[model samples]
Target: ANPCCSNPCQNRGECMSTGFDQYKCDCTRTGFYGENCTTPEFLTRIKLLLKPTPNTVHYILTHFKGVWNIVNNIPFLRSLIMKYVLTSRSYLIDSPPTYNVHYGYKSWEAFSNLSYYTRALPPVADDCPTPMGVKGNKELPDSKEVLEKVLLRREFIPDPQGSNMMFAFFAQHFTHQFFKTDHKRGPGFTRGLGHGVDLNHIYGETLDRQHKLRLFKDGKLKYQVIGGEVYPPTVKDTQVEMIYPPHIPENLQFAVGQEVFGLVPGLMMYATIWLREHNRVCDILKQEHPEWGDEQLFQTSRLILIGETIKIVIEDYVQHLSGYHFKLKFDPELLFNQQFQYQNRIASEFNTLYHWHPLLPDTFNIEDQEYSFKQFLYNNSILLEHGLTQFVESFTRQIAGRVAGGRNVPIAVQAVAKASIDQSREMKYQSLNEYRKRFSLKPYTSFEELTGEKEMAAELKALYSDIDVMELYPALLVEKPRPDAIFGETMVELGAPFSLKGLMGNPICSPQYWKPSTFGGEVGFKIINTASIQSLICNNVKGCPFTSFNV
Candidate 1:
């Protein structure tokens, strides 16, 4: 064994000395990524935009006030607005946040009254006007929409040209546009009554009857909710009614109509039903009905119908508590305040932090006046793009699994624990894989719970001893000749597509609103087509389809 007890190489190359001739070669570092250990910078960049843009902070503000009418407290609008944000591709619009407010009921001054009173609380929560669902003067005979119930004022946002509108567009659309139901007219009349786009007439009859309740001769309990309170089929059977002189019930309901309007957003409303089918309900139900089909697992029917009895309650009540009229008045101030908030929030929430704000306090505080409304709104588009996606994902994930299909509440809960440790395996695999890649370390075959941090750190160090782990691990050095590309072509996220066609081709896990709709009036071929899809996917089940997480 007359071998060289030496470094075994010359000129930094490892030397493999054979008996006759010697060989020398360079050694690859631990976890050396890419062909010939090439640069990994470009791959890193591509992955950055793979997620959402966090469009902008100002854009989110405009989106909420102008488009969605989203107050600080309401989860319903928040989730719905988020749903539209996720489904759409921002086009980046080249334009920034679009300038326009679409809060349905118009008044010149909306926000100023609350401005003085509201300054004390956190900016995140606007002062709630009234949250008592439906309000009626108790002494009065019948409850009705009251005129001058809330006051508002409006001022045009100074929309600068070439600014983005995605955030503003989304915020407005989710609150009013997404749940729109007109065929020829347009979704909601927030679109001005230019000619044929009149939504005031859409639910005219139902509102007319609110003041004129014809009581049942013989009292009867005609309707019942699955878990909550019950009701009569007729408006006559409700416990109490109130009225105001000259302001009849229908007129009052019309005055307080925004509450009814609040209930229409499908994304958040759907999630409301989706939350109920939990293990708390399912585990008990399955025990008795072992033969229950898989379709019965998810609950259904999140949309409240137009002119239906319960729908009237939503219209009369939630609309006022939500305070639409007040929001319209205060919005200009909201625009400026939101711009500042966006700047403040961007460092934390948004991915791309575009720095273009006034550094001085006096200058920064009044930036909204200096900048065009369009620029201010576009600023928030980034946050809207990203935050909305996250909200949709969260809302869907939480509710998709737990809902109980229509059945005896107790009976449905006992079924099966389909969501168990087995369900957790995929997540566990992801966690361990990430840990290994992040630390350039490996996991043990078995574990007694978890080991100490010291041992784990020591092992990780030894595993990456050969290379400057910190420099090569995730960081890229521009000085070094970077690799042409990181991910050559194949997708890392399986089942995702490279192009728009590819995206559509992949089974779109669309929202509940994307499902077949139900229009009580025009039940035609369009209705037949809608019904057919519902029958096919749901098998005529009463509840909704809780298929997957994103669905």
Candidate 2:
């Protein structure tokens, strides 16, 4: 008898007879390993180790922190260890690179007009579900109402992981750099310059805008000193167009790379910090090479600033989001000679997935004064009056809302939620279960299993009927969060591939660009290597007491 006849392989593994009586199990798609495919995948083990309740994460983070503290001082050793860690870790997590070349992989095909958003799975003929606002069946509940009820925050619920306002602000600031939606073309289309991780948010998206922002002397950006502190030049002073609300005074408006930055104080805070950092770097470059022209200094400083921004994003923001013990380093060398396109086109799915309006609480408590969500918008006065240090302190102390479901997103931003759902429908996205399967995550067996809240599950069941048919936007919010992670399992799985791929595929991370010569030699390279959120805040914000993304 053949060993394959017994179906000895587990977890849907295929058993192949190698000899008359011997067999081997092929577990490629089963997400399992071992001789009989009885063991869970190594990725599963890594996730299990990441769970905060187990104390394994604490041990790992602590031990690694000490190791990095010693190795980071030795540049050669640090580079070697970082390359090894990223290479090994990426092998386990980073999937093979996939391109969004619907037209072709030509230069023109890379833009939003020619390129299509990359899909994890091939398009299904009948993927488009009924709109949330439409009640198609008499048995189905009012999905629009249910969705609002599910998303509305009756009371502010703090993040369980102790993520503070700084975390929320950083997320908003960083994402705005890439997720530029074209209002005229709708959410399905992107207006981003399509340069991976370029600081287009700080240095304008167009050459004309960039020229307007540049000082053209000593490579510094135009600025104004307000209350003896550096700030982006006022729109009135610079005559630069910004998305200034009718009510916001001209003095309160800032001339920034992204028009949206002028509308929110938190966004302006980051813009101000980066503006300061840019001029500071330019000054250093000027001193190093007095013979260098203004153009050379500006270009080199922009490259250095972009490198620093990517470093902080990976090492600090991502590590906090991952809740992982592993010290994530920005090692561009890991992607060298790997299967990657070295190009990026912002995915429509990625734009929708990052709709994190739920992270904003009802109020911002700055300098002991509580301001409503409406007051916080289009308000640069608060930032200017309180100063960056005070704003940083306040944000660090104030807790942010959870990313999970419930009445979380403030009523003021409820429109943003509706817009996201509308965009999903417009894009004809697949069902939540379909996305889960695409990301190699197990599809939900029950609504209860998906939401982790009994009431929320019941509501979803009433609206969606089966767990498989739930829409992506709502289901993504309600899905049970993973142990010790900010996002749920599917969210992390779906997002990590795109985010890591885009970040690693950045032009700066390319083999040719990953050298000191590319970053204005050794000095700029060291500047990028030592960049962090804490360092940025402490260096730019005067008398800054402490800096953190947590309370």
Candidate 3:
């Protein structure tokens, strides 16, 4: 009566009983280590090549990685530190596998032989390596499509021997801190230009017309009391109560971001999780008297608006806390490591690229549980807490010297490392325009279909106008419709004063959505030179198709 598939192994060692299951072989002590255990139980033969004890490659790597520290931490490595520990364990540790695209942990050393997976690009420097998406040899990449990232080792020069090498790797590798001086550089986020706008609710993003809440209504919520005088909210939840649109009727622009320090700040975190723990006390007089208002009703509306924002914040925080540590890791210890992804190759990949938590291991190793990676992060990661960042004048001077003269910061080689964005309106407009070209699919028709003259409609009537002469390029002049141009019409027929054929369309209304134009991009001209739309505009003297369009 055994669980080893009815008497599994023939030898004594192989027959060793595991708690849950009965085993096979009962070979002697060294059975699995040598020929006896060479039965290949799927535990890939792991080999370690060291440089003669002290200067051995194993010693350098282990010391550099602080392997002991990571493997021993409670819960192994914290999600913040060994975030990517789950994935990088696959690498054979020695021979490189040709993995062109590295997503999670640093497994390149083991996967180097399989070029089907990767190709290393040359280094930009010790700090930067160009990035490319993963390309499988299953499909040949174009000459320009290959994303190559070359890996390089920063080893001690001229063999520092006992003194320089040992302490050097240990000092830097074991002493890493999470949220240290560079804490200011928290994980990259989609920072936006919070454009200051005066509105009913948050400006820019359209209100959820279908799911909006009213101030005095049941089930509505508020982050804080605006004037401390309005009727109590139906629901009150607080999360660092920062205002959206970030402006109050009394104050335009500027609000503080609130941070909480607990596991689950429910109702207290987003359930109660907010940067500002307490329900914010807004200065009503500060928002009103001097701010110059439209009316008292508007003022009251403002209070309701801020309250709704607080509710949203709390709700969002509640959802965020569902997980103990939110992370994506190439290596788990990376959170504690000074540089996010640099702690280990795989750990770094999760931080900068994939954006996922590192705890979910791929096929958990049964024998040692998490012994492999927990050991990896513990030995490699150094924990730093309560990080502080200060402006370094000399650092700026050095940075200034290294900048690309005409540029500010050097570009990061990874697709994700781009720090600078094109804020120029012209560039944005152009990009949007490109988007429209692809999205707008104009139906084609001969010019004669709409206008009497096939060739004339094809070309359209070109006329001189003030807009065309000055503001508009190449100019356009459609026969302005008159209110009463039709034979028996009571109203004057009015037409497009600037008949710019190319400015084909305008935005549509009622629940609008946008995607890359299958045709020309940038929200194609509202009107197109096509029969599908042209037929609708037929002979109606005073009709304007765009009178109903919305943003």
Residue 43 lDDT (model 1): 50
Off by over 4 Å in 1: 1-429, 432-518, 522-551
Candidate closest to the true structure, highest lDDT: 2
Per-residue lDDT value at 208 in model 2: 88
TM-score of 1: 0.18
lDDT of 1 at 389: 31
Number of clashing residue pairs in every model? 75, 3, 140
After superposing candidate 3 on the true structure, give the runs of residues whose Cα lies further than 4 Å from its correct spot.
1-224, 227-254, 258-272, 275-348, 353-551
Better-scoring candidate (TM-score), 1 or 2: 2
Worst 10 residues of 3 by lDDT: 488-497
Model 2 whole-model lDDT (C-alpha atoms): 0.73
lDDT of each: 0.21, 0.73, 0.20
Q: How much does each candidate deviate from the true structure in C-alpha RMSD?
A: 28.2, 7.8, 32.3
Ranking by lDDT: 2, 1, 3
Give the poorly placed runs of model 2, Cα more than 4 Å off.
1-118, 121-143
TM-score of every model? 0.18, 0.81, 0.17
